[PDB]
Design a protein around this nucleic acid. Sequence first.
DNA 1: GCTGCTGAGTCACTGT
DNA 2: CACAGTGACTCAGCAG
Lengths: 99, 105
Amino acid sequence: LTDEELVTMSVRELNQHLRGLSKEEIVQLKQRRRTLKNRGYAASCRVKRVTQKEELEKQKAELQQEVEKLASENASMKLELDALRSKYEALQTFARTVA
Amino acid sequence: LTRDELRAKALHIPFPVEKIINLPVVDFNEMMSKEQFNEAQLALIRDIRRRGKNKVYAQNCRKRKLENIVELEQDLDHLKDEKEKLLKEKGENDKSLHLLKKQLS
DNA sequence: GCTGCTGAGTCACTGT
DNA sequence: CACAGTGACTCAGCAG
């Protein structure tokens, strides 16, 4: 019995493969299956933590470039807004100097 | 008595397991000096030190993984707040530019 | 009893 | 050489 064949086997079909096995070899085969199942649980846990980390890092990189772009364009527009307000105010004081 | 301590006692190693693991390498070498250990004693001492130190490395490596996820989720939390704050600032600037252009044409 | 999960210890590596 | 880090495997032990 190869590895994944023993892991995919249900506990009901496992009892159908008790041909010529002693009481102990039935035990060791059950612990062999449990060990193989535990190896898959650890691998399944490691995969789950990796995708979570990679996804959180993907969202952070996207939001960091969004915030960096937002801060940059806001500073540039604020420059043009302040310049336009300066010319508007300068024209305001000149408008107060008329007859 | 731990399994490590029993094995060290069985091989007549006179040093405490704690000192084998935790001593800085300079003090560890001083402790090992002036001895006469055979290959079996040297191998067990090296095995106890390596396992004892690697145990803590794995502990720290798993603690860092958990702390790194907490820091990432905090980074996301602040970035969403900074994005919201920057959008409000962009709105006040867009509304001020609009009012100025309206005042003119 | 089994199933999933998970905290640790260990191994076989790689990195500084 | 030393120490340090890390994915994978292992077992133990708890919850379901």
